[PDB]
Design an enzyme around this catalytic site. Structure first.
Site, PDB file in Angstrom:
ATOM      1  N   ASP A   1       9.201 -87.671  56.021  1.00 50.13           N
ATOM      2  CA  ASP A   1      10.209 -86.759  56.627  1.00 50.13           C
ATOM      3  C   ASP A   1      11.279 -86.384  55.587  1.00 50.13           C
ATOM      4  O   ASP A   1      11.681 -85.218  55.603  1.00 50.13           O
ATOM      5  CB  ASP A   1      10.867 -87.389  57.871  1.00 50.13           C
TER       6      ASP A   1
ATOM      7  N   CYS B   1       2.791 -75.350  54.755  1.00 48.11           N
ATOM      8  CA  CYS B   1       3.638 -76.455  55.239  1.00 48.11           C
ATOM      9  C   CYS B   1       4.521 -75.870  56.345  1.00 48.11           C
ATOM     10  O   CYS B   1       3.968 -75.102  57.155  1.00 48.11           O
ATOM     11  CB  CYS B   1       4.356 -77.101  54.062  1.00 48.11           C
TER      12      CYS B   1
ATOM     13  N   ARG C   1       6.043 -78.179  49.686  1.00 48.28           N
ATOM     14  CA  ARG C   1       4.776 -78.968  49.601  1.00 48.28           C
ATOM     15  C   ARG C   1       3.608 -78.043  49.203  1.00 48.28           C
ATOM     16  O   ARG C   1       2.763 -78.453  48.368  1.00 48.28           O
ATOM     17  CB  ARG C   1       4.493 -79.689  50.912  1.00 48.28           C
ATOM     18  N   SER C   2       3.535 -76.844  49.770  1.00 47.54           N
ATOM     19  CA  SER C   2       2.478 -75.858  49.472  1.00 47.54           C
ATOM     20  C   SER C   2       2.505 -75.524  47.957  1.00 47.54           C
ATOM     21  O   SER C   2       1.404 -75.379  47.309  1.00 47.54           O
ATOM     22  CB  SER C   2       2.675 -74.616  50.325  1.00 47.54           C
TER      23      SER C   2
ATOM     24  N   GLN D   1      10.861 -76.603  46.050  1.00 46.19           N
ATOM     25  CA  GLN D   1      12.154 -76.380  46.780  1.00 46.19           C
ATOM     26  C   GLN D   1      13.282 -77.297  46.257  1.00 46.19           C
ATOM     27  O   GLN D   1      14.465 -76.987  46.592  1.00 46.19           O
ATOM     28  CB  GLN D   1      11.990 -76.642  48.280  1.00 46.19           C
TER      29      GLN D   1
END
Ligand SMILES: OCc1ccccc1OC1CCOCC1
EC number: 3.1.3.48
Length: 284
Positions: A181, A215, A221-222, A262
């Site tokens: 998370d 994602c 994450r992608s 990110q």
């Protein structure tokens, strides 16, 4: 400069934040006019994450051709990826329309449906064999065929039917279920295991349309997934595997979709994954 040495140099100096901001400053800026049209406001999960007009995927319909999805085309590596947001309640039909039209074999999902107590994407695939889904807006039917649940990821076999022509195809769903998370995984071992399972399936290969990767926003994450894959492929092809510059590959990819990677922790994790994965690519 061997990236493993660049890595120790950034880590010892603690300059991850400074490297990351240099990328953000040099990154491409292209127009996203179609994404910002008022008719498309409910097709976008996040106001600050849009596909560029030059690289966006078009739906094959006259009504409205818009989806929050981009084609990342890596010329030297000979790989293509579609990066997209987690589907919304009003975009699930569009999602499966895109998978059909682009001839994709695989969907790669890097998030859970709920994280941090909030919904990160719609429940867009069937959970029981005998309870199939039909999307009336795009005339498609989706059936669960089989499910293989492992400790770090689940693979599903799905059947997608074009109800207009009665053609069917097998789609593989690769679901990475253990990204935390907050932050990034401590070891890249289970992420690299996952990437090698997608590769083994044929989903990333030129005899199919591009893999669909998502994602929640389709950039974080992608971004990590496609950057690691492309960097390891380039290390396999080049005479000097030490010439692969991960910062330059990331800027090339950011010509096709904004914001890929990110945080400074995602940048560090991408280095770690490539460094550890290379200890297979170079003959172990
Ligand atoms: O095609 C619409 C549809 C058909 C079958 C089952 C669920 C479903 O849509 C739900 C609401 C919108 O978000 C996804 C879940």
């Amino acid at each position: 400069m061997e990236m493993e040495k660049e890595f120790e140099q950034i880590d010892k100096s603690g300059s991850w934040a400074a490297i990351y901001q240099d990328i953000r400053h040099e990154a491409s800026d292209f127009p996203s006019r179609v994404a910002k049209l008022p008719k498309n406001k409910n097709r976008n999960r996040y106001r600050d994450v849009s596909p560029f007009d030059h690289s966006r995927i078009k739906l094959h319909q006259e009504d409205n051709d818009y989806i929050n999805a981009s084609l990342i085309k890596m010329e030297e590596a000979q790989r293509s990826y579609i990066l997209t947001q987690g589907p919304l309640p009003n975009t699930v039909g569009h999602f499966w329309e895109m998978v059909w039209e682009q001839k994709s074999r695989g969907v790669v999902m890097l998030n859970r449906v709920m994280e941090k107590g909030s919904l990160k994407c719609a429940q867009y695939w069937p959970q029981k064999e005998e309870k199939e889904m039909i999307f009336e807006d795009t005339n498609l039917k989706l059936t669960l065929i089989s499910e293989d649940i492992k400790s770090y990821y689940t693979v599903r076999q799905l059947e997608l039917e074009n109800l207009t022509t009665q053609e069917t195809r097998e789609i593989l769903h690769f679901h990475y279920t253990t990204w935390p998370d907050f932050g990034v995984p401590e070891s890249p071992a289970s992420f690299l295991n996952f990437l090698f399972k997608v590769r083994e399936s044929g989903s990333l290969s030129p005899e199919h349309g591009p893999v669909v990767v998502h994602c929640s926003a389709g950039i974080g994450r992608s971004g990590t997934f496609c950057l690691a894959d492309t960097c390891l492929l380039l290390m396999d092809k080049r005479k000097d595997p030490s010439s692969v510059d991960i910062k330059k590959v990331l800027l090339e990819m950011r010509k096709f979709r904004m914001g890929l990677i990110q945080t400074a922790d995602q940048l560090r994790f991408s280095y770690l994954a490539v460094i550890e994965g290379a200890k297979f690519i170079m003959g172990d």
